[PDB]
């Protein structure tokens, strides 16, 4: 009486080197349109796109996930917690006209992978074959998390995505990237100072700053510091909870451990629900622009 | 140069309060939370012997000279991403001019 088993199928005769070019394409446009959001770049919003289209997933009934690329369908696009991503879509669409063969899902996911690597993050392995599915299997809204809650909520919300302690603390470190906008989700201020480069900053700010709880211009409470940095009640929950804090203490002291844990976790968050073929290709670890001589 | 030169005396009390808690200036001085700053100008980043830095402060590879330090002390965590120097920055350019004029005569 089963959940939907999503079989992955490759796009008619394409290999590593073709997707390498899709990586190289979206990495060049990343490099060139550097003006966006007061010089932060389109990088931090592509990862947020690759997450908000994988965080729709539920384990109990295989609905949501990154397979069908159901961000293009209106229901999802205008979800309150999904506000802002429209820019990430606008950025990605001229590449969907250069590569019409590529699937919507395979592009959003690759969008976030090509963002992290380019920002000098871990080499996150990636698998292809996220075939497009109809608009009737567009998931109802509200499946992303709410920021105003605490520790126990973040443990039990992420339990649905099949991620553990070690795995959610790792995924949370992507907050080292970009900032929170009051226009979109009603929170303001960056988590760190190096918004356009992926580092273990989120953790080094989490415990080395002196934080005080304040109310913003959207009548929401958030944790701010005098350096101009900021944390969500969910980001600050990572150190309130005793078990979460040991992992924040570890990744702050060892950045190479965070990188290895983020790659394993981010790829798994992206692959949630998809059953891969067994004659399917081994995962691709694309090379960056720095390495490729461009 | 681009950067001017404030009073070396206003720069002493700046260090005494905002930097002495993590960095040391004298020759062969002990490494604290941060390195022994002696001979910092003209020296490449991430090279105070006996200090286990981050691979961010090493791979940045810059030669410390009066101008790039002003571009570092303004907002440190933006100049060297991933650094373990827990510090926001000195926003007033006059206070940045006072402090560097003290440090180039101290770490000679
Ligand atoms: C404590 C916390 C502080 C404070 C208050 C300041 N700094 Fe320093 N700093 C600290 C650490 C832990 C490190 C190492 C960073 C890493 O490994 O990533 C640094 C490093 C520097 C350096 C670079 C050393 C080099 O080039 O090899 C400099 C130039 C430096 N810090 C200067 C500096 C000044 C002048 C400050 C006073 C206003 C200051 N820092 C404060 C830790 C801390
Ligand atoms: C708990 C849970 C959680 C939460 C609550 C969240 C939340 C959030 C919020 C609120 C925001 C803001 C928005 C605006 O625009 O304003 C964001 C952002 C964000 N985010 Zn995060 N997240 C999360 C998770 C996450 C993850 C997992 C990841 C990945 C991997 C992320 C990544 C992100 C990013 C990167 C960003 C940025 C964006 C920009 O800046 O553009 N994230 N986020």
CB A238 within 8 Å of CB A178: no
**Cα–Cα distance measured from residue A234 to residue A241, given in angstroms and rounded to the nearest whole number:** 11
- Domains identified in chain B, total number: 1
Locate B83 and state its tokens.
């650094």
Between the CA of A19 and the centroid of ligand 2 the distance, in Å, is: 26
**Cα–Cα distance measured from residue A131 to residue A6, given in angstroms and rounded to the nearest whole number:** 9
Q: Whole domain around residue B98: which residue ranges? A: 1-108
CB A129 within 8 Å of CB A10: yes
b/e code A89-113 from CB counts within 10 Å (16+ = b): bebbeebeeebeebbbbbbbbbbbb
Domain ranges, ordered by start, for chain A: 4-144+266-294, 145-265
* C-alpha pair distances (Å), A155 with each of A146, A167, A243, A244, B16: 13, 11, 11, 10, 44
**Cα–Cα distance measured from residue A204 to residue A192, given in angstroms and rounded to the nearest whole number:** 9
CA atoms within 13 A on the CB side of B10: 8
**Cα–Cα distance measured from residue B3 to residue B1, given in angstroms and rounded to the nearest whole number:** 5
Catalytic residue chosen out of the listed positions A51, A57, A126, A191: A191
Question: Is the four-CA dihedral A18, A20, A24, A30 of positive or negative sign?
Answer: positive
Tell me the binding residues of B for heme c: 19, 22-23, 85
3-class secondary structure, A6: strand
Domain at A145-265, CATH homologous superfamily: Peroxidase, domain 2 (1.10.420.10)
Q: Which residues contact residue A11 at a Cβ distance below 8 angstroms, ignoring those fewer than 6 apart?
A: A101, A102, A103, A106, A128, A129
| Structure letter (DSSP) for residue A5 | -
CB A214 within 8 Å of CB A204: no
CB A66 within 8 Å of CB A53: yes
Q: Which ligand is nearest to the CA of B58?
A: 1
Q: Is the domain covering A4-144+266-294 a CATH 3.40.50.720 domain?
A: no
CB A194 within 8 Å of CB B56: no
CATH of the domain at B58: 1.10.760.10
**Cα–Cα distance measured from residue A215 to residue A68, given in angstroms and rounded to the nearest whole number:** 39
Closest CB to A194 among B54, B77, B86: B77
């Amino acid at each position: 009486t089963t959940p939907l088993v999503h079989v992955a199928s490759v796009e008619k005769g394409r290999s590593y080197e073709d997707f390498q070019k899709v990586y190289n394409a979206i990495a060049l446009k990343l490099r060139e349109d550097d003006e966006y959001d007061n010089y932060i770049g389109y990088g931090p919003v592509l990862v947020r796109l690759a997450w908000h289209t994988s965080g729709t997933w539920d384990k109990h009934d295989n609905t949501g996930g990154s397979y069908g690329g159901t961000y293009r369908f209106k229901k999802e696009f205008n979800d309150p917690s999904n506000a802002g991503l429209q820019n990430g879509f606008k950025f990605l669409e001229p590449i969907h006209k250069e590569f019409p063969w590529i699937s919507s899902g395979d592009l959003f996911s690759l969008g976030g992978v090509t963002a992290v690597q380019e920002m000098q993050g871990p080499k996150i392995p990636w698998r292809c074959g996220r075939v497009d599915t109809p608009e009737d299997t567009t998931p109802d809204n509200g499946r992303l998390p709410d920021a105003d809650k605490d520790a126990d909520y973040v443990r039990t919300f992420f339990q649905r995505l099949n991620m553990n302690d070690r795995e959610v603390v790792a995924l949370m470190g992507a907050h080292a990237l970009g900032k929170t906008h009051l226009k979109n989700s009603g929170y303001e201020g960056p988590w760190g100072a190096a918004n356009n480069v992926f580092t273990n900053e989120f953790y080094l700010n989490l415990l080395n700053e002196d934080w005080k709880l304040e109310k913003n211009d959207a009548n929401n409470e958030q944790w701010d510091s005098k350096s101009g940095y900021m944390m969500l009640p969910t980001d600050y929950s990572l150190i309130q909870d005793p078990k979460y804090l040991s992992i924040v203490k570890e990744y702050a002291n060892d950045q190479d451990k965070f990188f290895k844990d983020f790659s394993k976790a981010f790829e798994k968050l992206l692959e949630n629900g998809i059953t891969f073929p067994k004659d399917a290709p081994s995962p691709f670890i694309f090379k960056t622009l720095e390495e490729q001589g461009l | 140069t681009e950067f001017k030169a404030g009073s070396a005396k206003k720069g002493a009390t700046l260090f005494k309060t905002r930097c002495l808690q993590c960095h040391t200036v004298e020759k062969g001085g002990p490494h604290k939370v941060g390195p022994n700053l002696h001979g910092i100008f003209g020296r490449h980043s991430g090279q105070a012997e006996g200090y286990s830095y981050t691979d961010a402060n090493i791979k940045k590879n810059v030669l410390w000279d009066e101008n790039n330090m002003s571009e570092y002390l303004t907002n440190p965590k933006k100049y060297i991403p991933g650094t373990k120097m827990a510090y926001g920055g000195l926003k007033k350019e006059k206070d940045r001019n006072d402090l560097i004029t003290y440090l180039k005569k101290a770490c000679e």
